[PDB]
Amino acid sequence: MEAIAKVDFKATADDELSFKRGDILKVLNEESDQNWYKAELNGKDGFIPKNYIEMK
């Protein structure tokens, strides 16, 4: 699927995906765990909180 960033994720570690509120976060593989989705911004990829995006 794909979902709209509701709050901005400001990552410290270069593995957790950093993104801004508004961005189109397209999901690659959430079929792993509900907590942290493996997704694609546009330019780069990483882990995204369920809470931070408009998943539903």
């Binding site: 509701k6 765990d33 907590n35 809470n51």
Partner: peptide, 10 residues
Amino acid sequence: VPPPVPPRRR
């Protein structure tokens, strides 16, 4: 209440 960040998991 702020939007929470889940634990990454070992």
